[PDB]
Amino acid sequence: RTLGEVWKERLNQMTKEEFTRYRKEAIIEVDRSAAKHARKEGNVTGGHPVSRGTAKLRWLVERRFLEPVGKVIDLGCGRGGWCYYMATQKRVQEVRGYTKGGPGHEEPQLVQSYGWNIVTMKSGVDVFYRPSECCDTLLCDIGESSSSAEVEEHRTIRVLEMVEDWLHRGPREFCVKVLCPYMPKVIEKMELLQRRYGGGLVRNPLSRNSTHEMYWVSRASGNVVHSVNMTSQVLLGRMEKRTWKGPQYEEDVNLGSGTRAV
Ligand SMILES: Nc1ncnc2c1ncn2[C@@H]1O[C@H](CSCC[C@H](N)C(=O)O)[C@@H](O)[C@H]1O
C-alpha cells in the first residue's frame, strides 16, 4: 500500500463535520468575498478573478515553475481563472480555452479584466474527443474526483494520454493537474512522461487536504515517487494535528482592467 492509499482509506472513514474540517486545515485560501458581491452588481471591470483558479495558477507562475509565452491553450477552463490570468502575462499574445459546459459543469464567464480582449473561450467541447492544436504553452486542469482510488488512477491515466498527444510544442511551457499521482499506473506513466518532456510534480498549497492532486509543470524536476510520497506524508500528518488552525487567508489577486494593444 502506497502512503497515498492509506490517505484515502482514512479520508473516507471520516464524518461530514470532521471531513469539512480536515480539508481546509492549514492550507492557504484567498478571500472571494469581494468578487462574489461584484458579480451581483454586475461589476465586470473591478479586476476581480472569476474563480479561486487564477490565484492557484499565479502561485505557480510566480515561483517560476513555468513562463507562459505566445499562444496559450487551456483544457477544461471552466469559468476561466487560468485564462483571464494568462491574458495579464507579458509574453502571452493569445489565450484560448475549451470546456465541457452543459448541466452540472461551469460555463465560461465573460468579464472585462486586463486583457480579456485577447482571450477566446469555447464551451460545449469535451476535450477527450477534440483533436490537438498548436500552442506555445499548454494548460489542463481536468480530473473528476471519486471515492475510489482505482477509479482515480484511471480517469488520470486517461487525461495523461489526452495530454501527451497535445504535447508537440518544442522546449515549451505547460502545467497539468494530476488527479491521482500515487497509484502505480500514474507513477509509471509520469516516470516515463518525465523522461520525454521533463518537468515535475508539484503539490499546490492552495489545494484542499481532501485531494492528493499535484501539478506537473515544465519548469520543475525531482524523483517522481519521492515527490508524491512527501505530499502523502503531509496530507497524512494534517489529520493528526492536535492543535487545529483553520485555513490561512491571503489576498485574492486583482487582474486590473482594460485591453492590451493591437
Ligand atoms: N472532458 C472535459 N473537457 C473539458 N473540460 C472538462 C472535461 N471534464 C471536466 N472538465 C472541466 O474541468 C473543470 C475543472 S475546474 C478548473 C477551473 C479553472 N482553472 C478556473 O480557473 O475556472 C470543470 O470546469 C469541468 O467543466
UniProtKB/Swiss-Prot annotation:
Which domain of life does the protein's organism represent?
A: Viruses
What does the record say about its membrane topology? Answer: Peripheral membrane protein
mRNA cap 0-1 NS5-type MT domain span: 1-261
The UniProt entry annotates the active site at K56 (for 2'-o-mtase activity), D141 (for 2'-o-mtase activity), K177 (for 2'-o-mtase activity), E213 (for 2'-o-mtase activity)
- For the site mRNA cap binding, which positions are given? K8, L11, N12, M14, F19, R23, S145, R208, S210
> Which reaction is the catalytic activity of this chain?
a 5'-end (5'-triphosphoguanosine)-ribonucleoside in mRNA + S-adenosyl-L-methionine = a 5'-end (N(7)-methyl 5'-triphosphoguanosine)-ribonucleoside in mRNA + S-adenosyl-L-homocysteine; a 5'-end (N(7)-methyl 5'-triphosphoguanosine)-ribonucleoside in mRNA + S-adenosyl-L-methionine = a 5'-end (N(7)-methyl 5'-triphosphoguanosine)-(2'-O-methyl-ribonucleoside) in mRNA + S-adenosyl-L-homocysteine + H(+)
Q: Sites of the modification Phosphoserine?
A: S51
| Annotated site, Essential for 2'-O-methyltransferase and N-7 methyltransferase activity, chain positions | D141
Q: Outcome of R155A?
A: 78% loss of N7 guanine methyltransferase activity; no effect 2'-O-methyltransferase activity
What does UniProt say on post-translational modification here? Phosphorylated on serines residues. This phosphorylation may trigger NS5 nuclear localization.
| Written domain comment of the UniProt record | Contains a PDZ-binding motif that binds to several PDZ-containing cellular proteins. These interactions seem necessary for an optimal viral replication.
Functional note: Replicates the viral (+) and (-) genome, and performs the capping of genomes in the cytoplasm. Besides its role in RNA genome replication, also prevents the establishment of cellular antiviral state by blocking the interferon-alpha/beta (IFN-alpha/beta) signaling pathway. Inhibits host JAK1 and TYK2 phosphorylation, thereby preventing activation of JAK-STAT signaling pathway.
Q: What is the protein's given name?
A: RNA-directed RNA polymerase NS5
